[PDB]
Design a protein around this ligand. Structure first.
Ligand SMILES: *O=C(*)(*)(*)(C1(*)(*)(*)=C(*)(*)N(*)(*)=C(*)(*)C(*)(*)(*)(Br*)=C1(*)*)N1(*)(*)(*)C(*)(*)[C@@](*)(*)N(*)(*)(C(*)(*)(C2(*)(*)=[C@@](*)(*)[C]=[C@](*)(*)C(*)=C2*)C2(*)(*)(*)=C(*)C(*)=C(*)(*)(Cl*)[C@](*)(*)=[C@]2(*)*)[C](*)[C@@]1(*)*
Ligand SMILES: *O=C(*)(*)(*)(C1(*)(*)(*)=C(*)(*)N(*)(*)=C(*)(*)C(*)(*)(*)(Br*)=C1(*)*)N1(*)(*)(*)C(*)(*)[C@](*)(*)N(*)(*)(C(*)(*)(C2(*)(*)=[C@](*)(*)[C@@](*)(*)=C(*)(*)(*)[C@@](*)(*)=[C@]2(*)*)C2(*)(*)(*)=C(*)(*)[C@@](*)(*)=C(Cl*)C(*)=C2*)[C@@](*)(*)[C@@]1(*)*
Lengths: 305, 306
């Protein structure tokens, strides 16, 4: 037993991370087959970022203006191109450790593992969720751009995020691996800001189910609630309303624990109205909302990769 | 910015995980050079586990009683021996994916990454801290024995934990890779339980520094204190004592915030004596003690402070 914020094994992704240098700027890139992907602002100087013309900036670059290092090995760049907000560098060597992979655009509420990298070298791995306001609450310092986020779907690495910048309020913005931003953000210096965030209700309920599975159930009560009555309480605490799709997604966890979903909702409602009374749930002194129902089943059943 | 519980990348350790089978039992082993390490209770039966004579049980077993599988490859066992509570199986093949490594024994308060494995294959990776009562609070299911904990420094893996069992309160017990149990737990069926735990003071201070760096500053007061006075407070509230070495290790965090270490101690003292008044710190309604000073420096200092 036990339940932890668990990242995917990162080995398959570590073998893909390289260092990309253009001018004075060094960041991270993703080496798959004979292409290296990285944020296109690597070609900008601090002056360009106020109002860049990326096409014009890229026409002035040559292949030899890009220095790509896989560990200590220099990779010869032989072509460069733009796709949306991503730069694609074609190299003369196919990554021999390219895993089975695909590129996926995820939705708010879905989780993934982030491999935080600096200078092409992986430093740490942690779980994140795509927030309702299309940001992520990660941990990133200068030099982290190009760090990627991913899931493992059976035998396939599903890349879903590449880091591009931190917004002034401390949250992080990036693109899918097609180069399109999540949310309304742009890779230039403007007056952009994230909208107000909300708590992912269905994920909190899944984590409460995880607690019951692992023998932590002090928060269960004898009350009932309707869906409509729960949602009015939820919306007052800046939780997102629970839809019938959300209720259905929690079916399997409800069946395994024997706790009806609306009975869990009545327990959550009292946690919101009265606090946790100095108690923890699964070691946490807060209501965790970055486990999906699928994350719970994956961890509690010991799926391997 | 941002502050998250972060594990080390697991790849160097994934390439070392194998499946070990003895009789009807299957668990995980660690394959380094030509040796496989795993918990010695793999040789036991349910009845043995009441009063196991491991020396006699090991003599009974022969090399061919152990099946070791690395992916789809069977490794031939050519010798076996015991070191404390770990079994060492000599195999006829050295692991080609052996990283640079060492075996280390950690102290309470130190953190490490755990790669939870089943049947020789990885499920996921998360961070753990050695509690003062020599347990850890992990995520381990049936079949997880032999999963290892580790730290990585540049290219060197320091293995510090091997998983052996779960205790009655849902916490976890294991050994270092020399087979020496953390704490007084034993690999036999016994009415054992984790003692009362305490809070790791230097880690709480590291975490309060991380909060300040990430803009959560309401708990800071105008007071200072001394190491001696603060340790009287720590003792009353079931906190570990704080040493001068701890003060030195917190230096980089004091420099990035401009808050002296003993000034932070006085702010923690006020939280312990007066409570948090329902406020959160980094989202948490209770003080967190599973981040070391090194863990916070790794996420917050960058090139500016060392
Ligand atoms: O480094 C970095 C970072 C990330 N994350 C977090 C942090 Br604290 C930091 N980065 C890099 C830089 N960027 C910028 C630039 C770019 C290029 C050039 C110059 C500058 C930006 C980006 C994007 C936008 Cl939209 C703006 C700005 C930042 C991030
Ligand atoms: O699997 C397992 C586990 C781990 N962790 C968590 C869980 Br839920 C589960 N395991 C295996 C088994 N074991 C036992 C013991 C140990 C130590 C002490 C006592 C008991 C056994 C072993 C061997 C035999 Cl033959 C039987 C039993 C636990 C852990």
């Amino acid at each position: 037993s036990g339940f932890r914020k668990m990242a995917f094994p990162s080995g398959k992704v570590e073998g893909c991370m390289v260092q990309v240098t253009c001018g004075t700027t060094t960041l991270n890139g993703l080496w798959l087959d004979d292409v290296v992907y990285c944020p296109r602002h690597v070609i900008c100087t601090s002056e360009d970022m106020l109002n860049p013309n990326y096409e014009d900036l890229l026409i002035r670059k040559s292949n030899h203006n890009f220095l790509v290092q896989a560990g200590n090995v220099q990779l010869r760049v032989i072509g460069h191109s733009m796709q949306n907000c991503v730069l694609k560098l074609k190299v003369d060597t196919a990554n021999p450790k390219t895993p089975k992979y695909k590129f996926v655009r995820i939705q708010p509420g879905q989780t993934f593992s982030v491999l935080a990298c600096y200078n092409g070298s992986p430093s740490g791995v942690y779980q994140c969720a795509m927030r309702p306001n299309f940001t992520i609450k990660g941990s990133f310092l200068n030099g982290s751009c190009g760090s990627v986020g991913f899931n493992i779907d059976y035998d396939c690495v599903s890349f879903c995020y590449m880091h591009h910048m931190e917004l002034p309020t401390g949250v992080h913005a990036g693109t899918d691996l097609e180069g399109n931003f999540y949310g309304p953000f742009v890779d230039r210096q403007t007056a952009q800001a994230a909208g107000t965030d909300t708590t992912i209700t269905v994920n909190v309920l899944a984590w409460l189910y995880a607690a019951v599975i692992n023998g932590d159930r002090w928060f269960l009560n004898r009350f009932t609630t309707t869906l409509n009555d729960f949602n009015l309480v939820a919306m007052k605490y800046n939780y997102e309303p629970l839809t019938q799709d959300h209720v259905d997604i929690l079916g399997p966890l409800s069946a395994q624990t024997g706790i009806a979903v609306l009975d869990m909702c009545a327990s959550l409602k009292e946690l919101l109205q009265n606090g946790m009374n100095g108690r923890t749930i699964l070691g946490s002194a807060l209501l965790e909302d970055e486990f999906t129902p699928f994350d719970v089943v994956r961890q509690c059943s010991g799926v391997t990769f």
